[PDB]
């Protein structure tokens, strides 16, 4: 059984599963010391001590950029306990999901080949001999992996295999892991999940256990090296690339493969005979095997093709962690190395970070006594200007991946005999073929001997030191430094647009901004007297948000092909294409290539295989059709490996330069944000430090400014998304018409070549078929240029879209809600259609019934409710929103509630007050605003949409697409509250439908559009607004006499229908529509229908001299074509040809119904021709 989780604490005992062993290699002193470990799981051990082998400290020369190297760490029992607790927490979290516990099951039975002369197994630690008594009791405790603490470098989590020789040959190795979970990086405004750091160590160890390691020699191009004046590539290890999957792993693992480097064949081939030997030698059950058959039967049952599919990014998807899938191994190193301590008991539980990945708010590891973050920035660049004394230094940071030249692309060899392998119908999910329960059920190994061939692994690699290179122009990194503020809190800030001002003094209070509106605001702003009341502080904050929103979100539609729109601020932020010319126009003249350093030594593959052999082989239609088919398809494959080859090269040469711009734009935004929060932050501190405002008022401004931070970050993310799209377009554009056209020209030449090759292959031995070649020709003409083409622009979007997503915040679109619903069985569902704020609650007692053009929720009972949380629904004074829905009041109710979003008498609610809508909303400051719509909702479908525009401070209310109040809301500030939006009647029965809350404040024009779209089905409606139904009886009225009902008159020596006055009986006359054919349930516009008057004989409606007399025969009925007009939507027209029904002038207390030619008034006929059903 899995989820073992000993959960052991301290040192209660040192017996049974708790053992004390001797270290494999020697300590730094040069001696092996005894130590104790704890068994977390079957064959899995932990030891909460720093790595014995690695020194507790090293010289400054040997320190790596972004290490810790603190010696007084994990040198106490409480730290050892903290680490122990940290491990079981992480392993429980691994056991939390199904895939995680499948890996741990595999690890428990992934013992390397236990080869023996009837004695031992593979490498392993020793049991205590009872040397306490100096006894010599020998025993071996099984251990597939051993988890140590951090070694010399705390930041480094490396998996050291105790013998690399057998860890490559396929024998395997029980590797030792030195992993530290307490510190993680950010990469943005979110914290990296420690399980990724530990899962990666487990996967690396699993390769060692299976003996499938790449021997450190097999490397792949990952990315063009980040510098100025280098043009080499930074090569990544294949094993790392397999694990750090992301989008870099999808581009080379498509269905047609690449040079396997023999590894994907060597390892598979080595696996074949390793599987073969077990079944024919070890499965013969030698008596000294000690039940290792089952572990080996399960270990060899799993295919390595499934271990390779285990990438580190799909695991992040399983735990639902956000991770930079673009360049996972490198993108985390492109800035100063900063670590944040994780308090595992508190800040990280079985379900990941407690406070979510963004808002966990950990503390920087910077502390005086211990923990020095040794940072050596590769390529410290200092801008130099001899126009005037100006020297502006900036630090660059790069990954620690080793670098090679452009060889891979130059001397890449396509092996023409690489036909498709594996790729059976079945291979596209994780952990498909293994046993969880069966592996778990197997007892552990507790009795046999163990070998020890400790291959030394002391490959010390003192790294490169920094280079101090000058520069003649202001780099983006220089601009980014200008954006940052590096001073006290108790010191002023000065904004400017002249970058040259800031560079003059390195850490002057002055900071550069590329946002004109923001600079204008800060031109006249003193922390002393500009803001003097709470209300003014809020307003200034609102004013900043507005101006900030306007500057960064600015985009214009582009005339460049392949680009929808262009961000004109990118010029002023990173100093790229930043001339006196407009950025739009500079991009025109300079082109898209102006955004990238063009790589001259770009390699385009040649892809020529004209080899066509000849002979007389007469088998299987002389194997001609087959031979040319397999040749045609191999040429298709060869060209496809070339297209795949050219995509990888474009990725690692040209996209890297684009994702890098994404990184640069990312900061540039955040930076400006940081400035805007800081200028606000200093202002708040100015109040507090000088006393000034009281606690109640102070606490509110603090509370509101804290809230506002994520609101800056909301539109900040929105800016990056505009960048994401803009850059991707540019990235695909470079490939589209600068790499692809050159690659197509090679294929076109090879097409005509291979075409001519097959034409030159006419081995027409003995008698020949002159005609048949031309049939063979069309098959293998190679005319299918498009068929061989695999340029699905979708593919490039799939790899480059949201590749670094939610850097600023996880928060999606806000104030977005549609709230539809569906039925299943007798059961219902209610969800956000837009898929935002999906944590909805409701009782299933609610019935879903047809309404106006939709399905409506029937809130009958008071107990019934719909409860919509406000997790991403902001109602701060800086947030404008609107609410839109359709409502019908089922029963005559004077006073009921509909909506409610109020907590402690703060928030907003909508309710019914004496058949009148009552909208009130009141804020935290005690400013109330209330509005009473007195249009007297009377049991009729109504479109209630009402918009709160926080820009102009206007509250608009539209009913049925028509604006009413348009009051001013200026006196009303933030009414954000935690309580959800509640929808319950409380006093009445209502029908609610199409309940939408919108991110922006609607206007008259757009509201009217929304109202009109609700009629686009062209259904006829009764008076109440409900859609008219066939074979349903109604009362007929002329819309001109609401009070008087159309009533039949029978046995008058003429039977007809007419409106009677002084009725006083109003003998209910019920009419129903019926159609001769295609009998439906819902009555659409423009349908042929007859009118049935309910009566004992059940007579129908016909025409006699244009009168509407009642016949009794239905073949004697008249056909009316129903026409509806939007202006009167609860009204019908019974038109035959170009005459419609009309009411006559009063004659004998009776108004007769007759057909009259329709007379209109600007497309809109008289009120008479319109009829209503009830």
Residue numbers in the entry: 1 to 1174
Quoted from the paper:
All BoNTs are naturally co-expressed with a protective partner protein (NTNH) with which they form a 300 kDa complex, to resist acidic and proteolytic attack from the digestive tract. We have previously identified a new botulinum neurotoxin serotype, BoNT/X, that has unique and therapeutically attractive properties. We present the cryo-EM structure of the BoNT/X-NTNH/X complex and the crystal structure of the isolated NTNH protein. BoNTs are 150 kDa proteins and consist of three domains: the 50 kDa catalytically active light chain (LC) and the 100 kDa heavy chain that is further divided into the translocation domain (HN) and the receptor-binding domain (HC).
